[PDB]
């Protein structure tokens, strides 16, 4: 699968890594700003109904990090038999701090091969103690509101498995529209390749709202105000688990506004052969 990538060069801090559905909210407000009111995601319904967004990590250089094939957590001891008998604790590096992996340690982090964890993670989840001021006098009020902070050459990217006509018609104009300060944003398109074996059961690469089909999956809970009235909790699968008993978990219509907000969660496959389960 020759799915292209979109690398977002930041210029400073982000609030959070955009969680693979908040982009589809932000894409929605972008195509609500441009193109009038009816070329918005109602018109892009059948176009994201065959093409996916599915966010992922920063890169820290050019090494495009990828989250985890979560089908190595059951039989991790079946993977690492080649190590010496002090391999447990490397499993704890590959279970508990199992966050993100290089591509070369992702084409073989699945397919039952001994991957290696990276450590050059471009995170500074720092605790910026912001504003304290009254217009006339003192104010004490240390309210924290922490944010994320990047490395010198790093940046988020995400993927796009779709036809390039639909990409350059909605999302690729929108990815330069996005560029309080934390919206620092420079867009640079790219292509990418993933080896991705046979498609029995494999990764979603997004946050996921499945169609009732649970296989080995971290649960998530995503809020989001999204023009005022607080969106519900909308239980999600986290970044990168394995629901491939024919997915296609549709986007969920909500209530609260004049026009409906409808939340992403539809996923796109990859290739994994998982051991058992």
């Amino acid at each position: 699968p020759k799915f292209i990538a979109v690398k977002l060069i930041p210029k400073g801090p982000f609030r959070d890594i955009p969680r693979a559905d908040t982009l589809f909210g932000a894409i929605g407000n972008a195509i609500s700003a441009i193109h009038g009111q009816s070329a918005v995601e109602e018109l892009v319904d059948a176009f994201v109904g065959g093409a996916r967004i599915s966010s992922a990590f920063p890169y820290s250089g050019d090494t495009y990090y990828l989250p985890k094939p979560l089908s190595v957590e059951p039989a991790l001891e079946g993977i690492l038999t080649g190590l010496d008998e002090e391999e447990r604790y490397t499993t704890a590096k590959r279970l508990r701090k199992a966050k993100y992996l290089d591509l070369k340690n992702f084409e073989l982090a699945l397919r039952l091969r001994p991957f290696t964890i990276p450590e050059e993670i471009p995170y500074a989840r720092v605790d910026v103690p912001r504003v304290v001021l009254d217009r006339v006098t003192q104010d004490s009020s240390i309210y924290f509101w922490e944010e994320i902070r990047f490395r010198e050459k790093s940046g988020v990217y995400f993927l796009y498995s779709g036809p390039r006509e639909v990409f350059d018609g909605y999302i690729a104009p929108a990815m330069r529209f996005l560029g309080w300060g934390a919206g620092l944003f420079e867009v640079e398109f790219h292509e990418m390749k993933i080896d991705a074996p046979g498609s029995e059961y494999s990764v979603t690469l997004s946050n996921a709202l499945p169609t009732k089909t649970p296989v080995l999956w971290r649960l998530l809970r995503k809020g989001g105000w999204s023009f005022g009235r607080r969106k519900p909790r909308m239980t999600f699968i986290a970044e990168g688990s394995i629901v491939k008993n024919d997915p296609g978990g549709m986007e969920r219509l909500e209530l609260g506004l004049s026009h409906e907000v409808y939340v992403y969660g539809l996923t796109f496959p990859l290739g994994v052969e998982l051991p058992e389960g």
Binding site: G12, A124, V128, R135, V136, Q138, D139, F177, W180, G181
Partner: protein, 274 residues
């Protein structure tokens, strides 16, 4: 609608350094460099502007019609929100200006240029103050050492013992351009001229008052040398090969840029206007 995103890009020279604190130390994110957080720039840029319209509320009063039910004051004597003095918003100790409804804050000249919230209001700030991040002269200056910060010691001198006490400050080195930027949404095209004139007014309140921490004794005295007024109307995003305004750059003094060349800069953007 949206016909927007004006980019004011520039460089801010701290003639006597900055002390945007966090020994008090400057904000230092990931490389050891300092930086002006865009929060502090927007915040001081609204305190100066809000006190300007606090003085000038009773006389504008027809332009910006929602700023008429105020009759200046702070609501700290009568400890309640929504009191018609000028500004309520009791956060934890402070009292700032936020209009408590969207329909009012389409017209309050401070509030419609930095937004409104509270209960059932939700006005977006119409501006994006990017944090300024140490332009590439002083980055390469920093690589060979050059001591980008400066530990500065003050004292509390007494008068009956004449004793003293160390109160170190560690401010940024006097003279450092910071790669300053401003992004502004240009919704409601009839508001826009007075709006960016008001933002330039608030920026012109700087260079004559303190940014950054323990001012009024030094530590402020910044200078905007902003180069490129740009525009991104509706075709920079659907396309972007060409067709955007680039204004004059070199020696644009902000106390002279405000109107003495601004209408010679406004009328090119009147050429697009849509």
């Amino acid at each position: 609608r949206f016909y927007g995103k004006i980019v004011i890009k520039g460089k801010i020279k701290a003639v006597t350094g900055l002390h945007i604190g966090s020994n008090p130390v400057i904000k230092d994110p990931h490389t050891g460099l300092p930086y002006i957080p865009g929060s502090s720039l927007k915040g001081r840029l609204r305190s100066l502007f809000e006190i300007l319209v606090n003085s000038r509320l009773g006389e504008w009063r027809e332009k910006y019609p929602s700023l008429a039910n105020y009759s200046p004051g702070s609501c700290r004597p009568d400890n309640q929100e929504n009191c018609g003095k000028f500004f309520n918003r009791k956060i934890n100790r402070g009292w700032i200006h936020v209009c408590p409804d969207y329909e009012t804050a389409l017209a309050c000249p401070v509030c419609r240029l930095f937004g409104a919230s509270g209960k059932e209001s939700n006005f977006p700030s119409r501006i994006i103050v990017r944090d300024a991040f140490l332009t590439k002269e002083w980055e390469e200056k920093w690589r060979a050492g050059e001591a980008i910060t400066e530990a500065k010691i003050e004292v509390g001198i007494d008068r009956v013992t004449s004793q003293a006490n160390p109160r170190t400050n560690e401010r940024v080195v006097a003279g450092a351009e910071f790669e300053f930027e401003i992004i502004y949404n240009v919704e409601n095209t009839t508001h826009w001229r007075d709006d960016i004139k008001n933002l330039l007014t608030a920026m012109a309140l700087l260079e004559d008052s303190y940014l950054g921490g323990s001012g009024s004794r030094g530590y402020g005295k910044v200078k905007f040398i902003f180069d490129s007024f740009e525009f991104r109307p509706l075709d920079y995003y659907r396309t972007g090969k060409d067709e955007d305004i680039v204004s004059i750059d070199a020696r644009e003094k902000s106390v002279s840029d405000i109107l003495s060349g601004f209408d010679s800069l406004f009328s090119e953007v009147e050429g697009k206007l849509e």
